[PDB]
């Protein structure tokens, strides 16, 4: 059934699974027209498809040309997501195909179920977790490749960098969700935290800074303080 805090260790067992987040697929700017009406302009988007055990991220870039001449784009975006996830599964060797796909938004359930009819054994599950994957576009290297795309494109990343050499998947996912929650709550301050010290760099082949174990403890504590701070500023506590 639905994924929640009670069955949370299931994410890090040995059954292949993917999270699918569709938040950033259909992205618009709302602006005024010369006549004083309101119009939207779409910008490139992406599907965020993540294996939480390995860190492997299948970032399918959604180029604005997809939407040309189409109606009801927010509905189309869910079906486009499901089409692309199904295409990804079919492209994978059988032993790499997931046994479960967890959608972060329940409106993806029926579109994905219908697109995956050929895969009766792949379970499509919602979750009651509020995961912060919408903030993927606050990661500079992911945002850069999406915005520069001139055509549909899939780009593969490891969202954990080399962390799994030193920590477990459970811990790596917790670090990731903390970083993304911080970037979602106050992007400027989170980015300031991550880049404050100029002697800590991002390897060309990585997404995050090369922190030592002790610096990650410092960073993580600073992220927790940020989230609680904003929770104070937000609710006056």
């Amino acid at each position: 059934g639905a994924m929640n805090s009670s069955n949370y260790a299931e994410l890090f067992n040995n059954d292949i699974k993917l999270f699918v987040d569709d938040t950033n697929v259909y992205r618009v700017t709302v602006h005024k027209t010369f006549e004083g009406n309101v119009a939207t302009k779409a910008i490139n988007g992406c599907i965020f498809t993540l294996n939480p055990k390995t860190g492997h991220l299948f970032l399918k870039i959604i180029h604005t040309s997809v939407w040309a001449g189409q109606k009801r784009l927010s509905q189309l975006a869910k079906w486009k997501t499901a089409e692309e996830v199904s295409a990804l599964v079919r492209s994978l060797p059988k032993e790499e195909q997931p046994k479960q796909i967890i959608v972060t938004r329940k409106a993806m359930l029926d579109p994905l179920e219908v697109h995956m009819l050929d895969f009766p054994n792949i379970a499509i599950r919602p979750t009651e977790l509020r995961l912060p994957f919408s903030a993927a576009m606050s990661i500079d290297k992911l945002s850069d490749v999406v915005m520069k795309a001139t055509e549909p494109q899939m780009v593969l990343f490891n969202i954990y960098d080399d962390w799994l050499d030193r920590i477990s998947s459970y811990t790596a996912f917790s670090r990731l969700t903390l970083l993304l929650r911080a970037l979602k709550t106050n992007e400027e301050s989170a980015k300031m935290i991550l880049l404050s010290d100029p002697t800590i760099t991002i390897k060309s082949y990585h997404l995050w800074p090369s922190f030592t174990d002790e610096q990650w403890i410092t960073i993580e504590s600073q992220m927790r303080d940020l989230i609680l701070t904003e929770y104070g500023r937000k609710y006056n506590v």
Binding site: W79, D110, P111, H115
Partner: protein, 300 residues
């Protein structure tokens, strides 16, 4: 006019014949039902006074044979049987008619309710949904499950309604996933009407039969089938104009005939609100929407 005689009424029972129902007392002298209109299917149904568990009954057409009812004290139910001796039957019926031992089905210079509820229902199609090829009449009861219900356990006692499933490969063409899920016209018109039912009359026949089994026997799987067949039409953007007009008449009489006190269990809020207010055909069911709003404004 035709007759269904009863050998006797050894146990106290409520007897239904089409939309009428009446009571007979334990060992009260009673030999059956006369003046049954020729040209329609009919259903004769039973609910025992001592155990209201299991409503059960028989679909039949008097043109297809001479049928009577006889209580079986071993299996504990009223059974329909066919009498092949035609002169014996006429003579039994004549003795019962002379002695005024049969209740009279209403005549009435005005009613069309039963016609309107069974317009497209044919015995031959009933006998393919209810498989018991040695009898010309068909038994249904409260507990019988449908083929689709069994997929999700005795196959010979099943209601073989046409399986409808909106998230199935039959319903969804490869490459037209969104199109076919949001607009069921290709499933309705190509797969079901052209492919399986052959015409809309057979579709409406199964829809009408499903409703009547839900209403008369409280058959839950029949209620599911009735709603699915309605939803498949209302969720199609492209439906022949004559089908929509006829569907409105069909549902009108079904809603008119439904007991007001059975609506809580016999009507599915989601399907009806979607069909009357959200679907492609939200503006095409004027008679049905008017009677639903005046009789069951709560559900909506």
């Amino acid at each position: 006019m035709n007759t269904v005689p009863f050998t006797s009424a050894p146990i106290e029972v409520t007897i239904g014949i089409d939309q009428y129902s009446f009571n007979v007392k334990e060992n009260q002298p009673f030999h059956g039902i006369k003046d049954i209109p020729i040209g329609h299917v009919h259903v004769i149904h039973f609910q025992h006074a001592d155990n209201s568990s299991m409503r059960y009954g028989y679909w039949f057409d008097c043109r297809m044979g001479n049928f009577y009812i006889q209580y079986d004290p071993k299996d504990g139910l009223y059974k329909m049987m066919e009498e092949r001796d035609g002169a014996k039957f006429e003579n039994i019926v004549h003795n019962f008619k002379e002695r005024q031992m049969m209740v009279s089905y209403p005549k009435i210079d005005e009613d069309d309710t039963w016609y309107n509820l069974t317009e497209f229902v044919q015995m031959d199609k009933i006998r393919k949904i209810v498989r018991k090829d040695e009898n010309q009449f068909s038994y249904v009861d409260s507990s019988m499950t449908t083929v689709q219900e069994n997929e999700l356990s005795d196959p010979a006692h099943s209601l073989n309604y046409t399986v409808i499933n909106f998230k199935s490969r039959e319903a969804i063409r490869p490459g037209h996933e969104m199109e076919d899920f949001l607009d069921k016209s290709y499933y309705l018109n190509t797969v079901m009407l052209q492919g399986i039912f052959k015409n809309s009359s057979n579709y409406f026949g199964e829809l009408q039969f499903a409703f009547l089994n839900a209403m008369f026997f409280g058959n839950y799987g029949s209620s599911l089938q009735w709603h699915a067949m309605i939803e498949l039409i209302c969720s199609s953007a492209t439906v022949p104009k004559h089908m929509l007009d006829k569907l409105d008449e069909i549902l009108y009489y079904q809603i008119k005939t439904l007991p007001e006190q059975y609506s809580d269990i016999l009507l599915n809020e989601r399907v009806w609100n979607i069909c009357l207010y959200s679907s492609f055909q939200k503006n095409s069911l004027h008679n049905t929407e008017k009677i639903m709003e005046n009789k069951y404004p709560e559900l909506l």
